[PDB]
Every structure is written in C-alpha cells, then in structure tokens.
Design a protein around this motif. Structure first.
Motif, mmCIF file in Angstrom:
data_model
loop_
_atom_site.group_PDB
_atom_site.id
_atom_site.type_symbol
_atom_site.label_atom_id
_atom_site.label_comp_id
_atom_site.label_asym_id
_atom_site.label_seq_id
_atom_site.Cartn_x
_atom_site.Cartn_y
_atom_site.Cartn_z
ATOM 1 N N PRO A 356 0.809 -1.227 0.000
ATOM 2 C CA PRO A 356 0.000 0.000 0.000
ATOM 3 C C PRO A 356 0.845 1.282 0.000
ATOM 4 C CG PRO A 356 -0.735 -1.614 1.668
ATOM 5 C CD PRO A 356 0.666 -2.000 1.246
ATOM 6 N N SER A 357 0.209 2.468 -0.038
ATOM 7 C CA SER A 357 0.939 3.741 -0.133
ATOM 8 C C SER A 357 1.724 4.109 1.133
ATOM 9 C CB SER A 357 0.065 4.895 -0.536
ATOM 10 O OG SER A 357 -0.415 4.764 -1.858
ATOM 11 N N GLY A 358 1.278 3.630 2.296
ATOM 12 C CA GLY A 358 1.932 3.939 3.555
ATOM 13 C C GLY A 358 3.012 2.949 3.988
ATOM 14 N N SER A 359 3.217 1.871 3.217
ATOM 15 C CA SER A 359 4.174 0.826 3.549
ATOM 16 C C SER A 359 5.628 1.299 3.530
ATOM 17 C CB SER A 359 3.991 -0.383 2.635
ATOM 18 O OG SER A 359 4.141 -0.025 1.268
ATOM 19 N N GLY A 360 5.986 2.134 2.556
ATOM 20 C CA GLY A 360 7.325 2.700 2.499
ATOM 21 C C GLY A 360 8.276 2.051 1.497
ATOM 22 N N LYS A 361 7.806 1.887 0.255
ATOM 23 C CA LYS A 361 8.621 1.346 -0.822
ATOM 24 C C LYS A 361 9.651 2.400 -1.238
ATOM 25 C CE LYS A 361 4.873 0.603 -3.115
ATOM 26 N NZ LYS A 361 3.649 1.394 -2.949
ATOM 27 N N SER A 362 9.192 3.645 -1.472
ATOM 28 C CA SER A 362 10.031 4.769 -1.862
ATOM 29 C C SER A 362 11.054 5.127 -0.789
ATOM 30 C CB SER A 362 9.206 5.973 -2.238
ATOM 31 O OG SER A 362 8.368 5.672 -3.337
ATOM 32 N N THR A 363 10.652 5.119 0.497
ATOM 33 C CA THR A 363 11.560 5.394 1.605
ATOM 34 C C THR A 363 12.739 4.403 1.620
ATOM 35 O OG1 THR A 363 9.808 6.508 2.916
ATOM 36 C CG2 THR A 363 11.639 5.416 4.187
ATOM 37 N N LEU A 364 12.425 3.101 1.549
ATOM 38 C CA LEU A 364 13.385 2.003 1.549
ATOM 39 C C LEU A 364 14.400 2.174 0.429
ATOM 40 C CD1 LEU A 364 12.553 -1.664 2.303
ATOM 41 C CD2 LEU A 364 13.815 -1.208 0.247
ATOM 42 N N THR A 402 13.341 8.208 -9.972
ATOM 43 C CA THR A 402 12.360 8.748 -9.030
ATOM 44 C C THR A 402 10.906 8.614 -9.501
ATOM 45 O OG1 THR A 402 12.698 10.984 -9.938
ATOM 46 C CG2 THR A 402 14.006 10.363 -8.004
ATOM 47 N N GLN A 403 9.979 8.616 -8.523
ATOM 48 C CA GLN A 403 8.546 8.550 -8.744
ATOM 49 C C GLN A 403 8.062 9.806 -9.475
ATOM 50 O OE1 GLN A 403 6.647 6.867 -5.202
ATOM 51 N NE2 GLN A 403 4.638 7.275 -6.038
ATOM 52 N N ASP A 404 8.586 10.979 -9.059
ATOM 53 C CA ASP A 404 8.297 12.276 -9.683
ATOM 54 C C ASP A 404 9.369 12.577 -10.732
ATOM 55 O OD1 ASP A 404 6.399 12.259 -7.626
ATOM 56 O OD2 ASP A 404 7.293 14.020 -6.550
ATOM 57 N N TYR B 469 4.554 13.377 1.909
ATOM 58 C CA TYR B 469 3.524 12.392 1.625
ATOM 59 C C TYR B 469 3.951 11.617 0.373
ATOM 60 C CZ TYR B 469 -0.514 13.528 4.749
ATOM 61 O OH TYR B 469 -1.338 13.642 5.832
ATOM 62 N N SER B 470 3.550 10.325 0.302
ATOM 63 C CA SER B 470 3.869 9.460 -0.835
ATOM 64 C C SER B 470 3.111 9.893 -2.093
ATOM 65 C CB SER B 470 3.617 8.015 -0.518
ATOM 66 O OG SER B 470 2.237 7.725 -0.560
ATOM 67 N N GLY B 471 3.558 9.400 -3.263
ATOM 68 C CA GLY B 471 2.967 9.788 -4.539
ATOM 69 C C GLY B 471 1.468 9.496 -4.615
ATOM 70 N N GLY B 472 1.053 8.330 -4.086
ATOM 71 C CA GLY B 472 -0.351 7.960 -3.987
ATOM 72 C C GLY B 472 -1.127 8.804 -2.981
ATOM 73 N N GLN B 473 -0.490 9.134 -1.848
ATOM 74 C CA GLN B 473 -1.076 9.998 -0.823
ATOM 75 C C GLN B 473 -1.315 11.428 -1.322
ATOM 76 O OE1 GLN B 473 1.361 8.590 2.965
ATOM 77 N NE2 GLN B 473 -0.586 9.579 3.476
HETATM 78 N N1 LIG Z 1 9.681 13.371 3.619
HETATM 79 C C1 LIG Z 1 8.859 12.687 4.412
HETATM 80 N N2 LIG Z 1 8.634 13.123 5.685
HETATM 81 C C2 LIG Z 1 7.790 12.433 6.473
HETATM 82 N N3 LIG Z 1 7.090 11.342 6.175
HETATM 83 C C3 LIG Z 1 7.322 10.946 4.906
HETATM 84 C C4 LIG Z 1 8.151 11.553 3.980
HETATM 85 N N4 LIG Z 1 8.141 10.869 2.777
HETATM 86 C C5 LIG Z 1 7.311 9.873 2.984
HETATM 87 N N5 LIG Z 1 6.772 9.870 4.265
HETATM 88 C C6 LIG Z 1 5.810 8.911 4.858
HETATM 89 O O1 LIG Z 1 6.391 7.625 4.858
HETATM 90 C C7 LIG Z 1 5.412 6.633 4.488
HETATM 91 C C8 LIG Z 1 5.908 5.934 3.247
HETATM 92 O O2 LIG Z 1 6.137 6.884 2.189
HETATM 93 P P1 LIG Z 1 6.705 6.394 0.778
HETATM 94 O O3 LIG Z 1 7.948 5.597 0.989
HETATM 95 O O4 LIG Z 1 6.767 7.535 -0.177
HETATM 96 O O5 LIG Z 1 5.498 5.484 0.244
HETATM 97 P P2 LIG Z 1 5.303 4.310 -0.843
HETATM 98 O O6 LIG Z 1 5.204 3.114 0.062
HETATM 99 O O7 LIG Z 1 6.425 4.423 -1.840
HETATM 100 N N6 LIG Z 1 3.854 4.645 -1.480
HETATM 101 P P3 LIG Z 1 3.444 5.072 -2.986
HETATM 102 O O8 LIG Z 1 4.548 5.850 -3.596
HETATM 103 O O9 LIG Z 1 2.297 6.037 -2.807
HETATM 104 O O10 LIG Z 1 3.189 3.979 -3.975
HETATM 105 C C9 LIG Z 1 4.069 7.379 4.411
HETATM 106 O O11 LIG Z 1 3.401 7.302 5.664
HETATM 107 C C10 LIG Z 1 4.495 8.815 4.093
HETATM 108 O O12 LIG Z 1 3.596 9.792 4.567
#
Ligand SMILES: Nc1ncnc2c1ncn2[C@@H]1O[C@H](COP(=O)(O)OP(=O)(O)NP(=O)(O)O)[C@@H](O)[C@H]1O
Ligand SMILES: Nc1ncnc2c1ncn2[C@@H]1O[C@H](COP(=O)(O)OP(=O)(O)NP(=O)(O)O)[C@@H](O)[C@H]1O
Ligand SMILES: [Mg+2]
Ligand SMILES: [Mg+2]
Lengths: 557, 567
Positions: A356-364, A402-404, B469-473
């Motif tokens: 899901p969007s809150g899991s943190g794929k992009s963060t990792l 990057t996603q963006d 916030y994430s791209g989907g968020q």
């Molecule tokens: N710069 C930031 N500061 C604080 N929280 C963040 C930041 N970037 C992402 N988050 C939070 O970290 C969580 C994961 O974000 P992110 O890694 O972008 O999502 P994702 O799993 O890649 N989702 P998606 O891109 O929407 O397919 C979410 O709860 C975000 O709100």
C-alpha cells in the motif's frame, strides 16, 4: 570568520578596488578637515586692513577652500564608481559559491525551504555584504580623521569649552547608540525572516496557480498572502518606530550640546572675549562634524545589523549484491516507517516490490540511494557498508529513477547531458531511440527542443522517457525503477524495460509497481506492508499464499 | 498610464505621506536658497569696517544662517522617515495586486516563466515605483525653486556674466543629458532582463537540485549559471562604463563653466570692480547649485530608466460570457469539429467530434502524442484559442465564464498541485465555507482518514511540493478536493495511477456513488478502467480512430489490442 568570507569573495581586482575606496575616502577626510581654518583666516582678514597683499591672500585662501570642496565632491563620485565596479566584481563569485553550497547540502535540508526563499536569501545576503563593504572602506578612517582633527585644532586655540563639549558629544553618542544597536539588529533580522517567509508563500502560490485558478478560492490564496504581508508590515513598523526615535533623540542631543557651544561663542563675541575668526571656525566645525557623526551612527548600526542577519545566513548553510540487514527508519521519532526489513538481492536478477501507499517502498529505496543516512541497521554492497561509501561512488553504482519527474527548463540535450557531460551528439541520439523518444508526432526529435518550466510542453509519458533516457547514458550496477513508467502504454513500457535489461545485463533491478504486468516479469516479488516484508517469493507462488497479491491478479478479469 | 497606477497604490495615509514629502522638500529649498545672501551680508558687514560693524546684527545673521542649515538637515531626516513609512504603506497593496493579476492570467502565459522570475519581477517593479515616487516628490519642485532663485538674485546684482553662464550650464546640461538618457534606459532595461533570466536559471536548478545531486554533474549545473552570470556582468559593465563617462563629462563641464565664473569674480575682486560680499555670494551659489544639478541629472535619468523598465513589466503581465448564467444539474458535453494547436507549426487535435451524456462513464485512451490531456484541458477551459465548438446543454464554452465552468466541470490533473500549508488549507481550496467535520468526512472518501495505523489530523503541515507524503497519498489530496465540490462533469486524467488496486477501486466507486448524475471522463492505459466504462474512445494522432464498447474495440482496434496483450 565572517570578514574572512567577505575578503575571500574579492579577487586581485576586487582587493585593489576596495583599498582604492579606503584610500580615496581617507585622503578626502584630511583635505576637508583643513577647510574651517581657511574660513577662519578669511573671516579675520576681512575685519582687518585690506592692503594689496591682503586681497591676494584672500583670493589664495578662496581657491584653497574651493579645492577642498572640489576634492571632496570628486572623492564621493570616485567612491561611487569604484563601489559599483566592486559590486559587479564580487556578485559572480558570491552567487556561484551559493549554488555550490546548495549542491553539497542533504536532501532533508534542501526540501524544507523554497526556491523563492532560496533566491531571496541570496538577495538579503548579497545586500548585507554590500553594506558591510561600504561601512569599512568609508565609515572607519574617514570619521576618525575628522573627529581627531577637530578636537586637536580646537584644543590648539585653547577653547576648552568647545573642545570639551565636542568630545562630550562623541562620548555620549557612542555610548547611547551602542546601547540601542542590539535592539535594532534583532528587529531588522526578525523583519527580514518574515520577508523571506512572504516570498516563499508567493512562490508557493505561483507554482500551484493552476490548481488555485481551477478551484477558484482567490479569497483563500489572497488571504494567506495578505496575512503574510500584514506580519511583514507590523515587523517593519516596529523597526521604523525605533530607528526614527533614535534619529530624533540623536538630533535633539545635537541641538542641545552643539547649540550650547554656539551660544557660548555668541556671548563670547558680544562681550569681546572671543574673535569673529574663532567664532566662524567653531560654527563651521559644528556643521563639518555632522557628516562624520552620521557615518559613525551608520557604522555602529549597519555593522551590528548586517553582521547579525549575515550570521543567520552562514549558519543555515552550515556485480553488486545488495544485502539489507534489519533496516529500521523514521522521518520523525514519533512514527516508524520501516522496521527490521531484511533483504538479500543478487546481481543480474530483476526483483519487484509492492504494497500500500503507507508501507514505504520509496523510503526504503531512497535509503539504498543514500537520500537519508540516519537509519538503524546495516546495508552492504559486496560486504561494504553504505556508511563507508561516499555519495559520489554510491551515485555511480546505483541509479534511482524517481517517482516524480525532474525536468530542467532547458534543451533536451541539457536534460540528457545531466547524466553524462562528455556525451557526443551521436551518442545522445542513440539513447533517444532506447527511450522511444527518437520520433514524436510523426516528426524527428531534435536535441535542441526547448523544454518549459516543469517540462509541461511534453506529455506525462514523454517526461518519464527523458528520465529513462538519462539511465542509458550512465553505467550503474543497481537500477531502481520507482513507478517510473506508469504513464507509458504496455507497448512502450515493455519495450523500454527490455532495452534496460539488454543494455545493462549484469544489473540488479528493483522495480516498484502496483500492476501485475511488472510483478509477473520478475525473478522474485516482495510484499511490504506497514513497514515490514509480509511476503516473499515468485509471483505465481505469492498468488496462492498471499491475499494481497491474489486480489491484484483478479483485477484483470 | 503609469502614474495613475502608482497614485492608485497609495491610500488616504499614503496620499498624505507623499504630499508631506513634496511640501517639506519644497519649503526646505526656499529656506536654503536664502543662505548665500546671508553670507554676502556677513561678508559685507565685516569687509571694510575696522571692527566698527554692529555685533548685534552679525549675531542675528549668524543665527539665520544656522536656522537655514538646521531646517535643511531636519528636512532630509523628515523626508527619510516619511519615505520609509510610505514604502511600508505601498508594498502591501502592490504585492496583493500582483498576486491577483497573476490569478487572472491564462495558463499559457503563466507557463512561460518560473516562480523565481515571478518573485524577482515584483522586486524590480517595486523598486522602480520607489525610484519614481522619490523623483516626483524630491526632484521636481526642489531643484526648480533653487535654479530660478539663483538666476533671479544674480540678475538683481546686475552680474550678467555669472547669471548668463549659470543659465548656459543648465541649458547645456538638460540638452546633453536628455540626448544620452535614451541609451542609459536601454542598457539598464537589457541588464535587468538578463538579471531576471539569471534568477529563473537559479530557481530552476534549486527546484531540480535532487536530480542534479544524484546525477552529479555539478560542473554542468554550475557552468550554466556561470554563463548566465557572465552575461549579467557584461550587460552591467556596459551600463557602468556609459554612466561613469556621463558623470565625468558632466563634472568636466562644471569645472570649466563654474570655474570661469570663479576666475572672473577673482579678477574682479583684485582689480576692484567686484566686492568681496558679491564674490562670496557667487562662490556660495556655485557650491549651492551642485545639489539641485545632481537632482535634475537624477530626475532626467531615473524617470526615463524606471519608466522604461516598468513599461515592460506592465506589458508582460497585463498583456463574451453570459451574465449570471444558471447551470443545470445534469450536463451533456457536445464537442463538434474541435481543432487545436499549441504552435502554428503542428496540429495536436484535428476535427474531433464527440457526444457525451449525463450520468454515463466514458473512457479515453491512445499513445502519448495523441492528445488526451490537451483535449480535456480545452473542455476544462485551459486554452481558448481553438477552431470548432464545444457545448454544454446547447451553450457554447466561449459564452461560459471561467467561474461557472470551474463549478460545473472538475478536472483531476495528471500532475499533483499540493500547496505548502496544512492539509486543511489544501482541502479548503475546493470549498472555503467547509466545516471541520465535513472536511474529515471527505478524508474517509479519499481513504486519507488514517495513515501509518494512526488517525490523520487536519493540522498536518505539508512541505514544498507535498513531498512529506507518498505519490499515492498526494493523489488522494487531489481526489479529496473533488468530494468537497458539486460538479456535473468529472474528468480523471491518470489521477489514480500511484494507488494500489484496493484504494483505486474503492475511491472510483465512492466518486460514482456520491456523484450519481455525473458525466465521468476517464483517461487510462490500463484495462481495469477501460472495461468498467459505458463507452471507450481511441484517440490516435489527434483524431478519434475508434468508438464503442470495450469488447467491440478489443478485437478491431490496433491500439487497444496492444493493451490486451498483457496476459
Ligand atoms: N519526507 C517525508 N517526511 C515524512 N514522512 C514521509 C516523507 N516521505 C514519505 N513519508 C511517509 O512515509 C510513508 C511511506 O512513504 P513512501 O515511501 O513515499 O510510500 P510508498 O510506500 O512508496 N507509497 P506510494 O509511492 O504512494 O506507492 C508514508 O506514511 C508517508 O507519509
Ligand atoms: N504545452 C505544450 N506545448 C507544446 N506541445 C505540447 C504541450 N503540451 C503537450 N504538447 C504535445 O502535444 C501532444 C499531446 O500532449 P498531451 O495532451 O499531454 O498528451 P497525452 O495524449 O495526454 N499523453 P500521455 O499523458 O503521455 O499519456 C504531445 O506531442 C506533446 O508533446
Ligand atoms: Mg512511493
Ligand atoms: Mg496526458
């Protein structure tokens, strides 16, 4: 430390121009400090006899007073021409240093400010340097020379009252103004910061103006800016009120102390104790002294004001097998994004990552890319820790799509040369075919195509192809595709992903996607849920065992 | 034109402060123009008399000269205090006008230039107004009073040479400086434009700094900026060299003509034809005249320089709807022979004919070059220069106001536009009068009610481009804005691409349930969204190649066949 930074901004030409300003202002101060004695000699000579040799001497003294005025007027024009020439000389090195300072900052620090804020921060800092440069070369030697000369010659005439009161004025002036200069610096710095905040809010409204326009609410966007301008006005009025109070108290002190010297010499001339020549010398010194006193008043305030605001600016500025072991990360201490994620990825294999969007794929993947370094756990590259790898070496080995999209407002050639500077024009066009951006609208693509702000003269999918073309110019071991082909159709998407695998055969590819198409084509799929790897294995094996992957496969029907 | 705009920027307080500056400067000019006559009378009283002059009259004259000096020094301090107070007063109305000017511009004109350019454009324009306000308040009445007074009293003393040469100087000055003021204005305007270009390039590098950092090439980014700054320096040096040449020629003319007056009165005092009182009066007039001459030199240059640069700003930014039209609850879209081009070189949309109806969900697809986004942007009213007709219930788009069209049609853009503010601010963009409980109901509808197993607060601060916030968020914020509006036509241009199958399908169902009588146009390259729709349209190379049910198009159409090969 701060003066050292300013001295380093000037080259050999800049050093000469700065010392020429300091010399011209000092020489002029010596010449003009002689003027009141010339007027005194004219004045007394008029009361006396008027012989042939008295008229010739009067004419000579009249020419010396004229030379004194001309020298002082030529010096202010020379200071102006040198000051503006020094501004031109210093601004290029100052701006380039600022851009290179921003390049060395970390992602977290870069993201917290705004471009409008960034450009206006340079404006405020460049102004402070200009102010500080003017106050040394002009308000140091010039006022001291004039204040010392005045006291010395008035002591020579044995006038202890005038020389005493003149010394008393400087002593009270320096004490009173330095006792309030701290309040002025704080109020001005607080105003300049609110000014930066107003620029960030204007920059933010203009960047999202299309959204504001289509949703209307001109009331909402303008009220936000109106409240920022009201905070700006109140902070400015606070400084204005104090500085004008200082100016009036300094002016009132001057009319009391220098007025006392004027009346003392008036009563002295009436009672016959003081000569007219001496009276005119004293009044001309009262008038002469205003300019140096104004320069001392500016020197004390502008050094404490510009040093305080420039201190804040300087402070603000200051074959790969991926093995991630117990990786834990948080953006803020309050909330946990990734908890104990353990992975073992190998070279030449294509892996998939979903959730899901809150899991943190992009963060990792940002942590693998080196965006954020404050993490608990270990990440290795061929038994080498990420912490022990430099940002430049990590950027060569790992390329993160990057996603963006980040498109530069320049030619397509510039956007692709970002990936490799030494790229030949024929080599760049070969990369355009690989990114399926060789032909657009049944016409060939020229590398001289100008791309507007945010590359919005190209479609969403066409912007993704520019970023994908940049990958083909680099030579990485690990390639990360974070939803980088979402706006591409199945034909272009599959054609580009196959070109990535053929051109980079020994490459560890990590793909982030919510679509079945990309998950099926991979060696292993990883399901990340609420910051932890919930499921791992082949796509077909995950379809049955895992509920989330199973529901994704049934969307096709 | 320009002066009316500046006079409108000042309120009742601003008008008073401006005329106070004009009065104080004019009064001071009268007082200081008396000073050389006082010195002449001091000189004459002393000259000749062997200390037998009246001391009381000398003391009185000394006090009048002192008052003249004090009045002039108090006036420059009062001008300073009023000028800075007027700067504070004018800047708020100037900035708000500029923001509201940008809101009324078309999308094409806004996309021309970056925000760094926009913020610096306000800096340059606000400075030009400040310059112009100073010159009209301080450089008009003050120098004329002083130049007229000087010639009048020197004519009174029957000194035809001094009065003649002083008049000659002003006549040559005004002619020579106005003959070069055009060159200075051009060079300065050209320099200020290059300065804006440098700011846009800095702003552009900072916005894409993360991309520059990860690709390295600090060399490339810095060299681009170095070349911009070199162009800036060369343009500045061109102006510097001419203005300094003007200053030296004006200074050299002053030492020849005013030096001739000084030598004439020197020989006059030696030969006994001129009095010392008159000689001192003439030399004090030579010294006095420098300040007004400097102000005339500034008046001529700064009005032609600031009027030229402020004319460019007014030009760029400054350059038939139905009254209170009541839109229907249910709207049908009828596009007849729509043709559009961004530039005359190429056609993007050619003769696209559609007929869409209320309550039905339509799909639109094709390659990247076909122009799905452009077509829907024209329906949204982004671009108005199109050939053909678009109707809403037999009402032309051309006859519909931008505010009515924005109420009836809501377009969910391909790119996300998140404001750097609270989540509440981002949602209140869609409706200002929204209650705090009503906004939270909308968060559930956008699946943004809970994030990271914790409830969402509406006071969550979102950073620049909402990248906390994430791209989907970010897409969910845009989708939440839809739920606060009440539209007849909803356009979804790849707006749920970064959502998973669960969230995507949950939100799309919520859109259809909450807006049942809504014409929904969906742009997608995925089979999931095409299959769920009443009719699908294939756009290829700017024209509708195929129309009908998804199953009918699946076989016949080539583009949709390429999509169907996934499995
Ligand atoms: N710069 C930031 N500061 C604080 N929280 C963040 C930041 N970037 C992402 N988050 C939070 O970290 C969580 C994961 O974000 P992110 O890694 O972008 O999502 P994702 O799993 O890649 N989702 P998606 O891109 O929407 O397919 C979410 O709860 C975000 O709100
Ligand atoms: N502002 C613009 N100026 C010039 N050309 C443009 C502009 N915007 C889009 N185009 C071109 O017009 C065509 C269609 O653009 P657009 O309407 O964004 O595409 P789309 O059909 O939505 N494709 P995609 O979003 O990638 O799935 C492409 O050839 C673009 O390069
Ligand atoms: Mg993401
Ligand atoms: Mg599009």
């Amino acid at each position: 430390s701060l003066f050292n930074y300013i001295y380093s901004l000037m080259d050999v030409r800049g050093k000469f121009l700065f010392f020429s300003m300091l010399f011209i202002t000092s020489l002029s101060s010596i010449i003009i400090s002689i003027s009141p004695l010339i007027l005194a000699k004219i004045t007394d000579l008029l009361s006396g006899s008027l012989s042939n040799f008295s008229y010739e001497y009067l004419v000579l003294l009249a020419c010396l007073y004229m030379f004194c005025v001309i020298s002082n007027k030529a010096s202010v024009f020379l200071f102006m021409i040198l000051q503006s020439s020094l501004r031109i000389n210093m601004q290029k090195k100052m701006s380039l240093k600022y851009l290179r300072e921003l390049y060395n900052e970390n992602i977290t620090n870069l993201s917290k400010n705004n471009a409008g804020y960034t450009t206006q921060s340079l404006n405020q800092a460049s102004n402070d340097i200009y102010i500080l440069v003017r106050n040394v070369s002009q308000n140091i030697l010039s006022p001291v020379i004039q204040l010392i000369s005045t006291i010395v010659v008035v002591l020579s005439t044995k006038d202890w009252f005038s020389a005493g009161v003149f010394f008393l004025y400087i002593l009270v002036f320096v004490i009173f103004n330095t006792r309030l200069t701290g309040s002025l610096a704080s109020l001005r710095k607080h105003s300049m910061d609110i000014t930066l905040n107003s620029y960030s809010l204007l920059s933010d409204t203009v960047d999202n103006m299309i959204a504001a326009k289509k949703n209307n609410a001109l009331r909402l966007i303008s009220e936000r800016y109106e409240d920022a301008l009201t905070q700006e006005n109140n902070a400015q009025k606070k400084y204005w009120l104090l500085s004008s109070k200082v100016l009036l108290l300094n002016s009132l002190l001057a009319v009391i102390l220098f007025g006392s010297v004027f009346i003392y010499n008036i009563l002295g001339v009436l009672n016959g104790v003081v000569s007219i020549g001496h009276f005119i010398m004293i009044t001309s010194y009262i008038i002469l002294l205003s300019t140096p006193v104004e320069n001392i008043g500016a020197l004390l305030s502008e050094i404490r004001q510009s040093m305080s605001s420039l201190a804040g600016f300087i402070q603000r500025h200051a074959k790969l097998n991926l093995s991630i072991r117990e990786l834990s990360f948080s953006y803020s201490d309050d909330k946990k994004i990734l908890n104990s994620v353990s992975l073992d990825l190998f070279t030449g294999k294509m892996y998939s990552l979903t959730g899901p969007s809150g899991s943190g794929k992009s963060t990792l993947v940002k942590i693998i890319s080196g965006y954020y370094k404050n993490y608990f756990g270990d990440i290795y590259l061929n038994d080498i820790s990420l912490r022990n790898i430099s940002d430049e070496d990590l950027n060569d080995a790992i390329y993160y799509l990057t996603q963006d999209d980040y498109i530069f407002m320049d030619t397509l050639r510039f956007n692709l040369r970002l990936a490799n500077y030494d790229a030949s024009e024929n080599e760049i066009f070969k990369v355009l075919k690989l990114a399926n951006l060789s032909v657009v609208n049944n016409e060939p693509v020229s590398l001289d195509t100008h791309l507007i702000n945010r590359g919005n003269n190209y479609s969403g999918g066409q912007k993704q192809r520019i970023s994908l073309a940049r990958l083909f110019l680099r030579k990485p071991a690990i390639i990360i595709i974070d939803e980088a082909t979402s706006a591409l159709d199945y034909i272009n998407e599959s054609e580009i992903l196959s070109s990535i695998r053929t051109h980079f055969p020994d490459a560890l590819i990590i793909n982030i996607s919510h679509r079945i198409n990309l998950l099926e084509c991979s060696d292993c799929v990883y399901v990340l849920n609420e910051g932890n790897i919930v499921a791992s294995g082949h796509f077909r094996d995950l379809m049955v065992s895992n509920e989330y992957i199973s529901g994704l496969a049934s969307v096709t029907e």
